[PDB]
Design an enzyme around this catalytic site. Sequence first.
Site, PDB file in Angstrom:
ATOM      1  N   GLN A  98     144.128 -27.061 121.335  1.00 42.54           N
ATOM      2  CA  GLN A  98     145.476 -27.563 121.245  1.00 42.54           C
ATOM      3  C   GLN A  98     145.947 -28.290 122.472  1.00 42.54           C
ATOM      4  O   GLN A  98     145.430 -28.078 123.561  1.00 42.54           O
ATOM      5  CB  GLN A  98     146.481 -26.406 121.023  1.00 42.54           C
ATOM      6  N   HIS A 100     149.920 -29.675 123.863  1.00 44.11           N
ATOM      7  CA  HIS A 100     151.348 -29.777 123.669  1.00 44.11           C
ATOM      8  C   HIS A 100     151.881 -30.871 124.557  1.00 44.11           C
ATOM      9  O   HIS A 100     151.727 -30.814 125.769  1.00 44.11           O
ATOM     10  CB  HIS A 100     152.083 -28.449 123.965  1.00 44.11           C
ATOM     11  N   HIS A 256     143.383 -27.119 125.587  1.00 38.03           N
ATOM     12  CA  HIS A 256     143.011 -25.761 125.860  1.00 38.03           C
ATOM     13  C   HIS A 256     142.695 -25.013 124.575  1.00 38.03           C
ATOM     14  O   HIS A 256     143.111 -25.445 123.466  1.00 38.03           O
ATOM     15  CB  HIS A 256     144.119 -25.034 126.674  1.00 38.03           C
ATOM     16  N   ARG A 275     146.457 -30.729 117.505  1.00 37.17           N
ATOM     17  CA  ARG A 275     145.165 -30.078 117.531  1.00 37.17           C
ATOM     18  C   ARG A 275     144.121 -31.105 117.980  1.00 37.17           C
ATOM     19  O   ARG A 275     144.277 -32.276 117.747  1.00 37.17           O
ATOM     20  CB  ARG A 275     144.787 -29.540 116.183  1.00 37.17           C
TER      21      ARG A 275
END
Length: 392
Positions: A98, A100, A256, A275
């Site tokens: 993932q 963000h 990560h 993702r």
Amino acid sequence: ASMQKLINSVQNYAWGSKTALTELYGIANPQQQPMAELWMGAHPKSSSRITTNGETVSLRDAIEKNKTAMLGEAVANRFGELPFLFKVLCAAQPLSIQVHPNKRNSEIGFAKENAAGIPMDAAERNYKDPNHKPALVFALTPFLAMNAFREFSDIVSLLQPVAGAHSAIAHFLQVPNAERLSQLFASLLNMQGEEKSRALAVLKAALNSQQGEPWQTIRVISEYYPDDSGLFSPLLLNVVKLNPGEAMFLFAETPHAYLQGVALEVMANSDNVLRAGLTPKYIDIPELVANVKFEPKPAGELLTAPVKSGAELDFPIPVDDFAFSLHDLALQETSIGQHSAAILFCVEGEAVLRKDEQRLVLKPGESAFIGADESPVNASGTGRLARVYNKL
């Protein structure tokens, strides 16, 4: 009651451990459900609850009715809600890679979703909200993870044995820069058909002739994700095994993954995710690339270095959304105080909390909510308590 013992939810996601919460904390699981996460917070999908008077109430509802008193003025004015979720994560299977986005880009992604009006929960429901999603993981058992790009010379050394897997790899090897790392990262995720099968065949062969890490991590992941382009990621990303008591912050714009083990996790409130592999689901590669920082992070900079002051071990967090500290307990009480709401969780041993005449005992795995208006509380016993709060 000043101090509110928490009734917490357990998410039975299929990747959770059937035993970890029971072995650690004595939590019952007669039906042998996978127990993936233990939630401590005010999330609207499954808020923790508190007891009054006799009844139980949602912590989220109780905060809504009394925001300043519960959260503290600073949090109530900045965020308008409890600004974190705190979890025990029990990964029996490796989880998705993932990324963000940062706060500004999250606001944009959110508006795009809304405008070219994607439903809420559909395909590219990648921006459920406009929030960033900083997080800290704190290992309770040995915790295997991937975090951030390796030094470029490290990536070079790891890719040599699989140079024949993909022309993007040879391309990077010729000139190992951030640009070609970006191209490589996107090419790997975009591989299809014979291209993908060639690449996976070369990787799989390298696992026979290359020993140790990160090859061993690839082997572990391949049991669950045999056909996933994310099998190459441990060659680009740092593989870290946190010892119990170590922590790491998950920065924006940084790939990560949680691979194995049990940890505490605290995060800002967002359900957003981009993702980047180890998933059968939705990957938007152009959007992913636009929100990744292709800059190496050296291995010595991955863990958060805490700071010890008396009984308190603070883990400095570079965002305002949450703070995280551990507290050693002894026979002599120590005062645990904060300007905000706090959640206290017994990591090990046994905690006796005291506020005036109230005493509340927490065994390992149990937690209490402390309203801002109820700070400080005094803590004694044995072992360690983790605290999540806000330093605003």
